[PDB]
């Protein structure tokens, strides 16, 4: 194991993040036991996962990790049931894994975070109900938004718009951010009211369109422009915890649930693959830059998997 | 001086957490009991099969520890209420568990959030837990003053923040509330940690809350501002209701991040303490009615029964009381002999009841400041304070003062009377049946004698007072009535509760009564109109009384003799609450009733709604002849 890497991970895998190289960045939690934490790892080798002596870079943090993003190649931006942002720098060498910046700006459990566009900013949501907008580089909050009515369970900023974003709240509302705006927010969605929305997905090409899970097991195709819902297909038995992207020209969407299934669909949202591998929740999913057939899922039974993708 | 918590929803490891929060000066620590995110699953496999443990042990904590420093928390995840099946069935699993844990820990209280409307399997799963052996630990009810949907920054352009005042909506979290614990039958065990927001609602949304079960108000750090030196302080407004809530005792828990970061969580302690130790001080009366606050105590009946040495003792030590007695027999005297007549004229001044003479020692002090000259019978049908009476006759007194143990009613007087004096007063004035004793004696006043005092008044107005409604509802008794508490009447210094209406007159007597034809009994309407919503739980009782011309007792508020605390307040109770809107008058009906053998009350609320009549003909409560 490496120096200032952690001789033991937290059993609960919350987030996998492929980095450009192929590298991979795992955040876990301890969700119970005597002490309540978590840890950032790196992985060079995807395959020694989740081995932690196998690993490239391991770091313990304060408190457990409800959400990651890679922040360009070297950079980890954190959500903490600490109320905390955590920025986290890798090493020149990437031997050690070295906090930059921890803000205590949320009042409860931050449970979402997105990186805008540029690099420069991100985008924080939280169980006080605020959803947060952060310069990085000044490592200070530039916006406070209490929008919502109840806990904000996503953000998502839109590939290439800065000013744009996608949050998602237990008051039943999707709203479609853009800073530009005096009033910021607005409440899109189906024309009817449904299930709580869970999990958001951008499409990559198409910067007008994203997909939303629900706590139902419904996953929905929306266009900002037709502010009407295109298509939904009930691919879970249980809430839709995650909704990912393949990297390909025509993408494929990974879905994942607290039913410890993973779905991968197309884009007309039929169902390509499933994989009943995991015997707990499945937290995350990542799709290799390297080989773009291959489908990495983390989940609460500790458990790395590798799929093949047809 | 204050008791405060720390409210957390991240505690890494236990015992650095609670050492932590104890060096910042908390009294305790509110906490998850399960991880906040660790979601379980009790009916789909594979995850049901989740490997333990469950959560930390409780070997991390004595259990003296577990039992004063901890209030658990329900996790957050947990949505018993939820319109998706799947999460209702495990949300139902998970609050049982949580709760089931709680108990195991021995845990003196524990947070469960009211933060929408429908709350009601959420109340179904708690009054189950509550009806699986019986406990003492509380469940405080995390509620908002202000929804958070009502809170919210009008940021979305195509739904603007209804700017429009709504007077009911704006008191939507209390209709939470109310709905909740009337599910839950007004357990014991159920309370109020009431949130307090930056925008604190109109006055008429906080006074919604005044009579409720309020255990811990929970004070963000966002409402904090901060003072030129950078210190956390609170608005006006905010102290003045922390004023308010030090009143009511609650218990204060501080939730969020510091957000005076060159400063520590004792910033905002030591404000609290600050305010609490420069609150406005309390009066003599409040001090003397500190331990009663909300202390039903069944009202005394010295007609029937031979009050205690110890009760006249209590009696005595009002001195202001006292006072205004020998000033209403000065200022009498002077009125009746002339400077003149002053040294060939005696008047013959009697006391009806003179337990152990202090009313006595006033007419001899009255006498001797008027400078005029009087014979005393004092007359007492409690011999054991006769005893007392004769010992200070025999050693002090002498032949001016002549001891009579006899009832006034049954009593030949040697001679006619210039002055009857009398303290046969309750705290609903008649209660103790002063205008019976009186009647009876005043055969042997002269024709132009006085009786001090001279006139009573009683006083009702209505109550609203959860608190009260359910102490009362706890006083069943085996082998009676199983709703007889509330056909009673309680002596009880009213401290949690809302006054709906200005007090109205109710009974009044005069003495002498010079009625051809004398009926004790009487029949009342009263009309309260009513400015607010509320709940009706009863009527606080009060009195007046003219000992002489100006000179006066009262309990009555707005007319309180100052510095008497003599007596408190009455309360009539009713059998079920009854929701008054406002505008509404509230119509109440009072009946003194009476034989040879019993005085009673009736009473009946006919307005918005009718009750039932209350101690139809004194079945439940009965004052003795
Ligand atoms: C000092 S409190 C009033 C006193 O009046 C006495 N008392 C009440 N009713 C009567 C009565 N009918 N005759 C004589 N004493 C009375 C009581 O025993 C009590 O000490």
């Given at each position: 194991?490496?120096?200032?890497?952690?001789?033991?991970?937290?059993?609960?895998?919350?987030?996998?993040?492929?980095?450009?190289?192929?590298?991979?960045?795992?955040?876990?939690?301890?969700?119970?036991?005597?002490?309540?934490?978590?840890?950032?790892?790196?992985?060079?080798?995807?395959?020694?996962?989740?081995?932690?002596?196998?690993?490239?870079?391991?770091?313990?943090?304060?408190?457990?990790?409800?959400?990651?993003?890679?922040?360009?190649?070297?950079?980890?931006?954190?959500?903490?049931?600490?109320?905390?942002?955590?920025?986290?720098?890798?090493?020149?060498?990437?031997?050690?894994?070295?906090?930059?910046?921890?803000?205590?700006?949320?009042?409860?459990?931050?449970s979402?975070?997105?990186?805008?566009?540029?690099?420069?900013?991100?985008?924080?949501?939280?169980?006080?109900?605020?959803?947060?907008?952060?310069?990085?580089?000044?490592?200070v909050?530039?916006?406070?938004?209490?929008?919502?009515?109840?806990?904000?369970?996503?953000?998502?900023?839109?590939?290439?718009?800065?000013?744009?974003?996608?949050?998602?709240?237990?008051?039943?509302?999707?709203?479609?951010?853009?800073?530009?705006?005096?009033?910021?927010?607005?409440?899109?969605?189906?024309?009817?009211?449904?299930?709580?929305?869970?999990?958001?997905?951008?499409?990559?090409?198409?910067?007008?369109?994203?997909?939303?899970?629900?706590?139902?097991?419904?996953?929905?195709?929306?266009?900002?422009?037709?502010?009407?819902?295109?298509?939904?297909?009930?691919?879970?038995?249980?809430?839709?915890?995650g909704?990912?992207?393949?990297?390909?020209?025509?993408?494929?969407?990974?879905?994942?649930?607290?039913?410890?299934?993973?779905?991968?669909?197309?884009?007309?949202?039929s169902?390509?693959?499933?994989?009943?591998?995991?015997?707990?929740?499945?937290?995350?999913?990542?799709?290799?830059?390297?080989?773009?057939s291959?489908?990495?899922?983390?989940?609460?039974?500790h458990?790395?998997?590798?799929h093949?993708?047809? | 001086?204050?008791?405060?918590?720390?409210?957390?929803?991240?505690?890494?490891?236990?015992?650095?957490?609670?050492?932590?929060?104890?060096?910042?000066?908390?009294?305790?620590?509110?906490?998850?009991?399960?991880?906040?995110?660790?979601k379980?699953?009790?009916?789909?496999?594979?995850?049901?099969?989740?490997?333990?443990?469950?959560?930390?042990?409780?070997?991390?904590?004595?259990?003296?520890?577990?039992?004063?420093?901890?209030?658990?928390?329900l996790?957050?995840?947990?949505?018993?209420?939820?319109?998706?099946?799947?999460?209702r069935?495990?949300?139902?699993?998970?609050?049982?568990?949580?709760?089931?844990?709680?108990?195991?820990?021995?845990?003196?209280?524990?947070?469960?959030?009211?933060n929408?409307?429908?709350?009601?399997?959420?109340?179904?799963?708690?009054?189950?837990?509550?009806?699986?052996?019986?406990?003492?630990?509380?469940?405080?009810?995390?509620?908002p003053?202000?929804?958070?949907?009502?809170?919210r920054?009008d940021?979305?352009?195509?739904?603007?923040?209804?700017?429009?005042?709504?007077?009911?909506?704006?008191?939507?979290?209390?209709?939470?509330?109310?709905?909740?614990?009337?599910?839950?039958?007004?357990?014991?065990?159920?309370?109020?940690?009431?949130?307090?927001?930056?925008?604190?609602?109109?006055?008429?949304?906080?006074?919604?809350?005044?009579?409720?079960?309020?255990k811990?108000?929970?004070?963000?750090?966002?409402?904090?501002?901060?003072?030129?030196?950078?210190?956390?302080?609170?608005?006006?407004?905010?102290?003045?209701?922390?004023?308010?809530?030090?009143?009511?005792?609650?218990?204060?828990?501080?939730?969020?991040?510091?957000?005076?970061?060159?400063?520590?969580?004792?910033?905002?302690?030591?404000?609290?303490?600050?305010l609490?130790?420069?609150?406005?001080?309390?009066?003599?009366?409040?001090?003397?009615a500190?331990?009663?606050?909300?202390?039903?105590?069944?009202?005394?009946?010295?007609?029937?029964?031979?009050?205690?040495?110890?009760?006249?003792?209590?009696?005595?030590?009002?001195?202001?009381?006292?006072?205004?007695?020998?000033?209403?027999?000065?200022?009498?005297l002077?009125?009746?002999?002339?400077?003149?007549?002053?040294?060939?004229?005696?008047?013959?001044?009697?006391?009806?009841?003179?337990?152990?003479?202090?009313?006595?020692?006033?007419?001899?002090?009255?006498?001797?400041?008027?400078?005029?000259?009087?014979?005393?019978?004092?007359?007492?049908?409690?011999?054991n304070?006769?005893?007392?009476?004769?010992?200070?006759?025999?050693?002090?007194?002498?032949?001016?003062?002549?001891?009579?143990?006899?009832?006034?009613?049954?009593?030949?007087?040697?001679?006619?009377?210039?002055?009857?004096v009398?303290?046969?007063?309750?705290?609903?004035?008649?209660?103790?049946?002063?205008?019976?004793?009186?009647?009876?004696?005043?055969?042997?006043?002269?024709?132009?004698?006085?009786?001090?005092?001279?006139?009573?008044?009683?006083?009702?107005?209505?109550?609203?007072?959860?608190?009260?409604y359910?102490?009362?509802?706890a006083?069943?008794?085996?082998?009676?009535?199983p709703?007889?508490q509330?056909?009673?009447?309680?002596?009880?210094?009213?401290?949690?509760?809302?006054?709906?209406?200005?007090?109205?007159?109710?009974?009044?007597?005069?003495?002498?009564?010079?009625?051809?034809?004398?009926?004790?009994?009487?029949?009342?309407?009263?009309?309260?109109?009513?400015?607010?919503?509320?709940?009706?739980?009863?009527?606080?009782?009060?009195?007046?009384?003219?000992?002489?011309?100006?000179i006066?007792?009262?309990?009555?508020?707005?007319?309180?003799?100052?510095?008497?605390?003599?007596?408190?307040?009455?309360?009539?109770?009713?059998?079920?609450?009854?929701?008054?809107?406002?505008?509404?008058?509230?119509?109440?009906?009072?009946?003194?009733?009476?034989?040879?053998?019993?005085?009673?009350?009736?009473?009946?609320?006919?307005?918005?709604?009718?009750?039932?009549?209350?101690?139809?003909?004194?079945?439940?409560?009965?004052?003795?002849?």
């Amino acid at each position: 194991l490496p120096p200032n890497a952690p001789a033991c991970m937290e059993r609960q895998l919350e987030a996998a993040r492929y980095r450009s190289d192929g590298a991979l960045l795992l955040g876990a939690s301890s969700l119970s036991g005597r002490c309540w934490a978590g840890s950032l790892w790196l992985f060079k080798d995807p395959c020694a996962a989740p081995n932690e002596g196998f690993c490239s870079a391991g770091v313990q943090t304060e408190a457990g990790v409800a959400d990651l993003t890679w922040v360009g190649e070297r950079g980890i931006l954190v959500a903490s049931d600490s109320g905390a942002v955590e920025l986290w720098e890798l090493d020149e060498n990437e031997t050690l894994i070295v906090s930059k910046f921890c803000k205590y700006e949320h009042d409860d459990i931050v449970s979402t975070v997105s990186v805008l566009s540029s690099g420069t900013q991100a985008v924080s949501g939280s169980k006080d109900i605020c959803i947060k907008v952060w310069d990085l580089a000044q490592q200070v909050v530039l916006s406070s938004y209490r929008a919502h009515a109840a806990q904000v369970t996503c953000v998502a900023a839109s590939p290439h718009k800065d000013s744009v974003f996608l949050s998602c709240s237990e008051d039943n509302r999707i709203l479609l951010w853009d800073t530009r705006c005096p009033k910021p927010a607005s409440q899109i969605g189906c024309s009817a009211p449904g299930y709580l929305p869970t999990s958001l997905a951008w499409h990559p090409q198409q910067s007008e369109v994203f997909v939303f899970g629900d706590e139902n097991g419904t996953v929905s195709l929306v266009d900002t422009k037709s502010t009407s819902c295109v298509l939904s297909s009930a691919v879970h038995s249980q809430c839709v915890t995650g909704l990912v992207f393949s990297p390909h020209s025509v993408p494929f969407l990974a879905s994942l649930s607290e039913d410890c299934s993973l779905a991968v669909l197309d884009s007309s949202l039929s169902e390509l693959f499933r994989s009943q591998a995991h015997r707990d929740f499945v937290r995350d999913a990542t799709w290799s830059p390297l080989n773009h057939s291959l489908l990495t899922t983390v989940g609460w039974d500790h458990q790395v998997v590798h799929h093949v993708v047809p | 001086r204050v008791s405060s918590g720390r409210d957390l929803n991240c505690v890494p490891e236990i015992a650095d957490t609670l050492g932590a929060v104890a060096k910042q000066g908390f009294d305790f620590l509110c906490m998850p009991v399960f991880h906040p995110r660790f979601k379980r699953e009790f009916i789909q496999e594979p995850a049901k099969n989740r490997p333990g443990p469950q959560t930390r042990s409780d070997l991390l904590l004595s259990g003296r520890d577990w039992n004063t420093l901890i209030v658990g928390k329900l996790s957050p995840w947990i949505r018993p209420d939820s319109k998706v099946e799947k999460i209702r069935r495990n949300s139902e699993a998970a609050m049982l568990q949580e709760l089931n844990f709680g108990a195991y820990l021995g845990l003196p209280a524990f947070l469960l959030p009211l933060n929408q409307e429908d709350n009601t399997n959420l109340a179904r799963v708690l009054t189950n837990h509550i009806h699986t052996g019986h406990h003492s630990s509380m469940f405080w009810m995390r509620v908002p003053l202000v929804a958070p949907e009502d809170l919210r920054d009008d940021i979305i352009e195509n739904a603007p923040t209804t700017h429009t005042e709504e007077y009911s909506g704006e008191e939507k979290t209390w209709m939470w509330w109310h709905n909740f614990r009337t599910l839950c039958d007004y357990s014991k065990r159920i309370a109020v940690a009431l949130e307090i927001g930056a925008d604190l609602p109109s006055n008429h949304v906080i006074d919604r809350w005044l009579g409720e079960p309020i255990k811990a108000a929970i004070l963000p750090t966002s409402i904090f501002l901060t003072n030129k030196k950078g210190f956390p302080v609170l608005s006006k407004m905010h102290q003045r209701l922390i004023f308010r809530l030090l009143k009511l005792e609650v218990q204060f828990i501080i939730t969020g991040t510091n957000h005076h970061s060159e400063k520590e969580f004792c910033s905002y302690l030591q404000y609290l303490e600050y305010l609490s130790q420069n609150r406005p001080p309390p009066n003599a009366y409040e001090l003397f009615a500190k331990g009663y606050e909300d202390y039903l105590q069944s009202p005394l009946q010295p007609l029937m029964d031979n009050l205690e040495s110890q009760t006249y003792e209590v009696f005595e030590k009002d001195p202001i009381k006292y006072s205004q007695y020998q000033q209403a027999i000065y200022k009498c005297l002077l009125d009746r002999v002339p400077e003149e007549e002053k040294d060939t004229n005696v008047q013959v001044l009697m006391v009806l009841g003179a337990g152990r003479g202090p009313l006595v020692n006033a007419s001899l002090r009255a006498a001797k400041q008027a400078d005029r000259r009087i014979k005393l019978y004092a007359v007492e049908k409690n011999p054991n304070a006769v005893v007392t009476l004769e010992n200070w006759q025999f050693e002090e007194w002498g032949s001016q003062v002549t001891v009579v143990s006899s009832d006034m009613r049954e009593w030949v007087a040697p001679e006619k009377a210039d002055i009857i004096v009398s303290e046969l007063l309750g705290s609903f004035a008649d209660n103790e049946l002063s205008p019976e004793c009186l009647d009876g004696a005043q055969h042997f006043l002269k024709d132009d004698g006085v009786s001090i005092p001279g006139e009573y008044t009683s006083f009702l107005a209505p109550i609203s007072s959860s608190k009260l409604y359910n102490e009362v509802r706890a006083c069943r008794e085996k082998d009676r009535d199983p709703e007889a508490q509330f056909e009673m009447p309680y002596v009880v210094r009213l401290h949690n509760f809302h006054q709906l209406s200005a007090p109205q007159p109710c009974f009044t007597f005069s003495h002498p009564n010079r009625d051809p034809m004398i009926d004790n009994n009487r029949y009342c309407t009263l009309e309260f109109p009513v400015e607010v919503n509320t709940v009706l739980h009863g009527f606080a009782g009060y009195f007046e009384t003219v000992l002489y011309q100006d000179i006066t007792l009262s309990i009555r508020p707005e007319t309180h003799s100052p510095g008497m605390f003599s007596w408190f307040p009455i309360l009539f109770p009713i059998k079920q609450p009854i929701t008054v809107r406002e505008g509404q008058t509230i119509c109440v009906r009072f009946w003194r009733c009476s034989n040879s053998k019993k005085v009673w009350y009736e009473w009946a609320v006919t307005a918005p709604v009718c009750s039932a009549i209350h101690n139809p003909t004194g079945r439940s409560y009965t004052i003795g002849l």
